[PDB]
């Protein structure tokens, strides 16, 4: 009949065929990630590729139905998603070649190790070893060496490939009627039809840059603070009005200043907010941990974990004999099958993680009734954000008491709170300019705005202007530092880490208001608050189904991304920082360097 009604009768065969064929690949993938065998890892490739095959088939099959002559949105969404040429739109060479570039980068990044000039017989890779140095070592040189080696050895190797990469990928991107590969990624945030809730691949950059401004005041102050705190650690190496030497920021890229805590702590005299001690004392085990996380969700009006979750999941490492990969993950296999893989140790960190990952699970269930193709967080940012709110509520000293982990009569020094907040900032706020700068440069490369021969010039020009950091050694085009970082040299949009990060505040906020929370926004725990749950679940149950803008509305009552909630969460820290910076200088010279002596 009508192309609409006859498309409905395509998606319907697609869902109930994809669902199963996907569950094939999941069950495989799962076997492997848990009983790492050669037998298993091979199965993980059978249904795995049978999936990619099944897809390409149905992709080109779905092309048959004209994007144009449709109107049941839901269907238009699904079809759109499925009709995704991607690789097809290219040649045969200029497609397998791209594919080549990718895998090499991936492996060289994973397989790259660097060699100790002072002892050539020992040479470690990024993780651990290098990452270990960057996180811990307080030796200017030791640090400078790791940072440089990496960007110099594997940095340079990747330069040519990355140059070739940007072309074929743009070629790809432009072919599907996009302004550039960047325009392809921004694509994720797009919405059409649906008046009042629209969004275009421009509206993003406009909104990111607008939002990123209001952060600056906060940023520059945190900056100013750690700078002075650092001068003390590396006396003579730092300028009191300069950028921060990129190799002194606690990790390899300075993506997060977390590890700088030991050096920047406001009140080093105050101790643990750590119940790892108290948990093991009350003889808690894996079960107790998750059974608690379970309780937490139920508390706000959400469901118990499924019987299948308990009897199928893996909450504990089997040690040896059966070796397993332990990165904590939630699994939405389909067919009502929800699982966590977590090699649990009775630690606060893990306890929190369990609240995070079980959050993803709860989302995964919420949107399960949606047709297969619509099962997925509103945008790339939504799922990680939901995950993160959970650790927000669980980490409050309030929740920790009302559970018997935090000793009854412990009070909150405004100093322990400033401690904790700084802690947060090092991570949540440090990574933001870092992020936004990173994907700006990437964006601009794809918009053809950075010439091959001025790639590293423009990188560091922006690290200085935007992020307030500088290179310990100067770097010509022989290098390729942006790709020194996983996400970049492994073809992954990084901007998600910016938007998620905003959302996750807009969320927790909306939810506390609704849970009626009285203290500073950061003292908020949403437990026992069924009223708040309802409001969350309102976006949760949607999946990719409604536009993300609507999805956001359901929770925070607004149609767009707002940073105010994030700044609120940093009010008591922000003011305290303006104080500490009384006599400090706030801002930086792009001009100063560590080097040239």
């Amino acid at each position: 009949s009508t192309i609409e009604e006859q498309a409905k009768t395509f998606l319907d065969k697609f869902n109930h065929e994809a669902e199963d064929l996907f569950y094939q690949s999941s069950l495989a993938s799962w076997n492997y990630n848990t009983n790492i065998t050669e037998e298993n890892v091979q199965n993980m490739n059978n249904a795995g590729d049978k999936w990619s095959a099944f897809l390409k088939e149905q992709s080109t099959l779905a092309q048959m139905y004209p994007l144009q002559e449709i109107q049941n949105l839901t269907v238009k969404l699904q079809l759109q998603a499925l009709q995704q040429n991607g690789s097809s739109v290219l040649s045969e060479d200029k497609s397998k070649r791209l594919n080549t570039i990718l895998n090499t980068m991936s492996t060289i990044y994973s397989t790259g190790k660097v060699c100790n000039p002072d002892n050539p017989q020992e040479c470690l890779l990024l993780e651990p070893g290098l990452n270990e140095i960057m996180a811990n070592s307080l030796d200017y040189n030791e640090r400078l060496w790791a940072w440089e080696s990496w960007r110099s050895e594997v940095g340079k190797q990747l330069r040519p490939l990355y140059e070739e990469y940007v072309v074929l990928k743009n070629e790809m991107a432009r072919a599907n009627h996009y302004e550039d590969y960047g325009d392809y990624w921004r694509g994720d945030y797009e919405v059409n039809g649906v008046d009042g809730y629209d969004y275009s691949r421009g509206q993003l950059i406009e909104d990111v840059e607008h939002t990123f401004e209001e952060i600056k005041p906060l940023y520059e102050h945190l900056h100013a603070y750690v700078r002075a705190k650092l001068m003390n650690a590396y006396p003579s190496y730092i300028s009191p009005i300069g950028c921060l030497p990129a190799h002194l920021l606690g990790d390899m890229w300075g993506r997060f200043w977390t590890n700088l805590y030991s050096l920047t702590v406001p009140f080093g005299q105050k101790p643990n907010i750590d119940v790892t001690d108290a948990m093991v004392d009350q003889a808690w085990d894996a079960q107790r941990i998750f059974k608690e996380a379970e309780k937490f969700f139920v508390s706000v009006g959400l469901p118990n974990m499924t019987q299948g979750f308990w009897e199928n999941s893996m909450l504990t490492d089997p040690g040896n004999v059966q070796k397993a990969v332990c990165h904590p993950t939630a699994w939405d296999l389909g067919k009502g099958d929800f699982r966590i893989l977590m090699c649990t140790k009775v630690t606060m960190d893990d306890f929190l993680t369990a609240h995070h990952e079980m959050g993803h699970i709860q989302y995964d269930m919420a949107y399960a009734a949606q047709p297969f193709l619509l099962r997925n967080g509103a945008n790339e940012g939504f799922h990680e954000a939901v995950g993160e709110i959970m650790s927000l509520s669980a980490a409050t000293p309030k929740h920790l008491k009302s559970i018997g982990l935090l000793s009854p009569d412990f009070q909150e020094d405004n100093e322990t709170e400033i401690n904790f907040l700084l802690k947060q900032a090092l991570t949540i706020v440090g990574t933001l300019p870092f992020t936004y700068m990173l994907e700006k440069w990437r964006w601009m490369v794809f918009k053809g705005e950075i010439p091959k021969d001025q790639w590293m010039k423009k990188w560091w020009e922006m690290k200085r202007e935007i992020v307030g950091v500088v290179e310990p050694v100067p770097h010509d085009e022989t290098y390729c530092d942006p790709a020194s970082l996983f996400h970049v040299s492994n073809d992954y949009s990084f901007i998600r880490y910016y938007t998620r990060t905003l959302y996750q505040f807009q969320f927790q906020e909306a939810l506390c208001q609704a849970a009626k929370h009285e203290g500073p926004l950061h003292k908020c725990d949403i437990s026992n608050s069924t009223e708040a749950g309802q409001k969350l679940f309102n976006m949760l149950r949607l999946g990719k189904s409604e536009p993300w803008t609507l999805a956001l509305e359901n929770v925070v009552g607004a149609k767009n991304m707002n940073v105010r909630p994030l700044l609120n969460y940093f009010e008591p820290l922000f003011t305290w920082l303006k104080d500490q910076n009384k006599n400090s200088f706030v801002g930086w010279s792009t001009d100063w360097s560590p080097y040239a002596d």
């Binding site: 009768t9 199963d20 069950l27 099959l61 299948g308 199928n312 009502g336």
Partner: protein, 174 residues
């Protein structure tokens, strides 16, 4: 009396090709099954007791699909494989058969129909397996708009109860 042959029966049919057993003469108590937390559903429709006096349909569906073996009810199963009248009725019984009807590797015998021109009239049945064109055209899989109308359930043992296999017995009254 011959209820042992229906429940407790080894092999069960797909929903699309459901079985009817005729039982006249024989009188039973109904207390055979009245008392069991083996049965997960057991919703009755217009009765419940013993006056000593009959049709018994059986088949297997997915957990969530059980909803649809009641008068009215949404579709696919009720639209296309097995329709209960709004009028007449007796009872509908189900039990979880994960262990029997499902396997680690996945079990695929059990089928259902999701494509059909028209809806079933109550107690009607359709065992046709004719490639489906949403216009009545002939066919040749997968000729852009040609699909087979029968779908495999594919019951694995590690799925949500919603997706685990359930056996069903419907007792119509005459």
């Amino acid at each position: 009396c011959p209820f042992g042959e229906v429940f407790n029966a080894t092999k069960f049919p797909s929903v699309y090709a459901w079985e009817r057993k005729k039982i006249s003469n024989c009188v039973a108590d109904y207390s055979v099954l009245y008392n069991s937390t083996f049965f997960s559903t057991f919703k009755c429709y217009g009765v419940s007791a013993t006056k000593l006096n009959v049709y018994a349909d059986s088949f297997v569906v997915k957990g969530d699909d059980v909803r649809q073996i009641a008068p009215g009810q949404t579709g696919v199963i009720a639209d296309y494989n097995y329709k209960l009248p709004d009028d007449f009725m007796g009872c509908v019984l189900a039990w979880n058969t994960r262990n029997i009807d499902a396997t680690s590797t996945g079990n695929y015998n059990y089928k259902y129909r999701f494509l059909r021109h028209g809806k079933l009239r109550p107690f009607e049945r359709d065992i046709s397996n004719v490639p489906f064109s949403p216009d009545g055209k002939p066919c040749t899989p997968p000729a852009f708009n040609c699909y087979w109308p029968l779908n495999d359930y594919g019951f694995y043992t590690t799925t949500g109860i919603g997706y685990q296999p359930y056996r069903v017995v419907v007792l119509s009254f005459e």
